[PDB]
Write an enzyme that holds these catalytic residues in place. Structure first.
Site, PDB file in Angstrom:
ATOM      1  N   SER A  93      90.979  79.955  35.407  1.00 47.13           N
ATOM      2  CA  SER A  93      91.884  80.974  35.645  1.00 47.13           C
ATOM      3  C   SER A  93      91.779  80.774  37.040  1.00 47.13           C
ATOM      4  O   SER A  93      92.558  80.783  37.521  1.00 47.13           O
ATOM      5  CB  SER A  93      91.892  82.465  34.966  1.00 47.13           C
ATOM      6  OG  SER A  93      92.456  83.508  34.897  1.00 47.13           O
TER       7      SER A  93
ATOM      8  N   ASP B 298      96.332  81.560  24.291  1.00 46.72           N
ATOM      9  CA  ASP B 298      95.582  81.699  25.392  1.00 46.72           C
ATOM     10  C   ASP B 298      96.650  83.789  25.099  1.00 46.72           C
ATOM     11  O   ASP B 298      97.682  83.733  25.813  1.00 46.72           O
ATOM     12  CB  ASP B 298      95.066  81.708  26.455  1.00 46.72           C
ATOM     13  CG  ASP B 298      94.553  82.275  27.757  1.00 46.72           C
ATOM     14  OD1 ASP B 298      95.473  83.428  27.722  1.00 46.72           O
ATOM     15  OD2 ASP B 298      94.010  81.183  28.255  1.00 46.72           O
TER      16      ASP B 298
ATOM     17  N   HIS C  57      91.364  83.915  26.166  1.00 44.58           N
ATOM     18  CA  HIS C  57      91.889  83.412  27.420  1.00 44.58           C
ATOM     19  C   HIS C  57      90.398  82.538  27.805  1.00 44.58           C
ATOM     20  O   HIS C  57      90.826  81.909  29.209  1.00 44.58           O
ATOM     21  CB  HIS C  57      91.870  84.600  28.529  1.00 44.58           C
ATOM     22  CG  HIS C  57      92.598  84.063  29.525  1.00 44.58           C
ATOM     23  ND1 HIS C  57      93.043  82.944  29.743  1.00 44.58           N
ATOM     24  CD2 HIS C  57      91.506  84.823  30.805  1.00 44.58           C
ATOM     25  CE1 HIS C  57      93.403  83.053  31.397  1.00 44.58           C
ATOM     26  NE2 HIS C  57      92.432  83.897  31.978  1.00 44.58           N
TER      27      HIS C  57
END
Ligand SMILES: [Cl-]
Ligand SMILES: [Cl-]
Lengths: 265, 270
Positions: free
Chosen positions: B95, B217, B246
């Protein structure tokens, strides 16, 4: 370790430090007309860019200093070791963009940037006139590698705009570099591109330019003014050459003092 | 340890001449890599570190302007790589850290063999021709709630983001590090992650990128993986995983770790 590798010298006194970064072919002695006007009010920090003739050739990592980032990390190491709080950074040419990048990494360490003969990119681009074509850069680099002393003897007068007591001082520091290191630094300064990052520079920038710089087109000062992310101000000088702080200190130093002491807005 | 090492709790494990660098995402600490590290140490040197602003780092080192951009974090990553590596690393970033690594690879592409991105997004906000997945009005209200009732916002956000059972070890690990963060710093990082725009910088990334995504996600649209694939400046490859959440490297390690190992060990052609 960091202070010795860059010949870090601290002068004067005061609650604010003024950091002076020289450009290609120079050493910290290029600021000699400016320092005495600052020491009574400011602490003044002088340092040499790694690769200057005054520095140890053993410390010149050719890969690390093929990029602008390597010089920016050097500056940050100098500030962390020798300053506290926010400084006033003054940088000529290469060091102006070194400081621009360093201020994105560590904006909490800069009060403002004072840029002299600044260019975010020397190479020409579709909608961007940096002043140099790629195929000419290749020829200059080959000519610099094969006939080193002959190349420097012709370039440095053009860069100062001279040839000839005005350029003798620049000649002394330029030939102090080792040729392989000098060639590596010349490639880095002519191939970096700070255009994509100017919008993330947030600290105030004072953009000082020579109205007849053979390396820096006049419009680039306006380009920087329009694309820096924070506040900026532009002042041109009726000087000739790329190093006005050395060839014409009677005009350039009063300009630098004014932008160092007075803040935008 | 070193100044940069202590500030980021840098840890070096493993063996062998190639170094795999693991960068965690928002609300995590380096312990999020619990399931990947033991599969690497017999073949790769492993460098772990904490993003500045994680609860495990010193709040005095987190300056809100400094870390309002990806460049601020990329500087820290570059400092860590220059100090604890000499070769070209294999960077795995989840991320936030996937974009931090991408940004870092623009300044110093020579330091990276490849980037392995997990749950990567170049921009969360929606814009006229780009579906990041989140409208501006939602972000504004998330950030208000995150400031007005911070723990209540976090308690509702955490189970949906990780998407797994709250009686599972994944939720416990994630909840601990998420609530370990200092609230004002947490709000700062959340503002940065939901306002950076990497779209103009993707064309300047040139190192190979492996784009690993979770098909379900709750933060990252599946379509963004192809957007990254279309717009990165060098080679890239995409692989999706039948996972939910996620943070699949923590919630579904049985699915995710084999995928990561393959993309760590194999170059992009293979
Ligand atoms: Cl220069
Ligand atoms: Cl994240």
């Amino acid at each position: 370790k960091v202070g010795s590798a860059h010949n870090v010298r601290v002068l004067g006194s005061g609650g604010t430090t003024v950091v002076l970064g020289h450009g290609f072919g120079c050493e910290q002695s290029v600021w000699r007309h400016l320092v005495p006007h600052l020491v009574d009010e400011y602490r003044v920090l002088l340092y040499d860019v790694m690769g200057a003739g005054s520095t140890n050739p053993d410390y010149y990592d050719f890969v690390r200093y093929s990029t602008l980032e390597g010089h920016a990390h050097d500056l940050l190491a100098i500030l962390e070791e020798f300053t506290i709080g926010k400084c006033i950074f003054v940088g000529h040419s290469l060091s102006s963009m070194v400081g621009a990048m360093a201020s994105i990494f560590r904006p909490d360490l800069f009060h403002k940037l004072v840029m002299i003969s600044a260019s975010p990119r020397v190479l020409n681009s579709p909608g961007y006139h940096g002043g140099l074509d790629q195929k000419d850069l290749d020829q200059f680099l080959v000519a610099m590698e094969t006939n080193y002393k002959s190349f420097l003897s012709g370039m440095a007068p053009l860069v100062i705009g001279c040839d000839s007591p005005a350029f003798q001082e620049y000649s002394r520091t330029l030939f102090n570099m080792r040729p392989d290191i000098s060639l590596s630094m010349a490639r880095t300064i002519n191939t970096y591109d700070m255009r994509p990052f100017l919008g993330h520079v947030t600290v105030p920038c004072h953009i000082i330019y020579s109205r007849e710089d053979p390396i820096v087109p006049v419009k680039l000062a306006e380009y920087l003014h329009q694309n820096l992310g924070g506040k900026s101000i532009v002042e041109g000088m009726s000087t000739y050459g790329h190093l006005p702080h050395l060839s014409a200190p009677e005009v350039t130093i009063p300009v630098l003092l004014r932008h160092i002491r007075q803040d935008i807005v």
